[PDB]
Amino acid sequence: MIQRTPKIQVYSRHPAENGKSNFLNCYVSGFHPSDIEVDLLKNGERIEKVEHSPLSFSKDWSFYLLYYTEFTPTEKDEYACRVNHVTLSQPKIVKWDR
């Protein structure tokens, strides 16, 4: 039996340009077990309406998740990924570093 804490990377698909449409990713990698919750936050509020399913796979004992949503960066909007997992004593919030 193992427990492995996820690595969490938050990044835009392309170089961010204020007012230009883009995608914000959340790659959550190398975790075990597979049960997990991953949300995108905008100004501290949970993004609810995501069109695309996440891409999920295991290799083979680690799990991987790519969660992405369309967005248009602005100067004033702050984004963060929030992850909860058994390996975390409280939810982990990782800010998008633009």
Side-chain angles (χ1 to χ4, degrees), residues 1-63:
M1 192 217 97
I2 65 177
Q3 308 200 310
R4 293 276 180 273
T5 295
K7 183 190 183 162
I8 307 161
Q9 300 165 285
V10 190
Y11 60 95
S12 55
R13 180 182 293 182
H14 308 299
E17 311 186 19
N18 280 341
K20 306 223 156 187
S21 56
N22 206 150
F23 288 81
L24 194 52
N25 303 121
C26 293
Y27 188 42
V28 183
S29 64
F31 58 100
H32 191 110
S34 58
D35 286 52
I36 197 162
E37 179 171 27
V38 174
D39 282 294
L40 285 166
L41 302 185
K42 170 183 182 190
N43 303 143
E45 283 148 12
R46 192 222 259 177
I47 297 177
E48 290 299 295
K49 285 164 290 170
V50 170
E51 313 173 30
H52 304 103
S53 280
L55 173 55
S56 187
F57 59 89
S58 48
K59 299 167 59 74
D60 282 316
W61 329 288
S62 266
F63 292 83

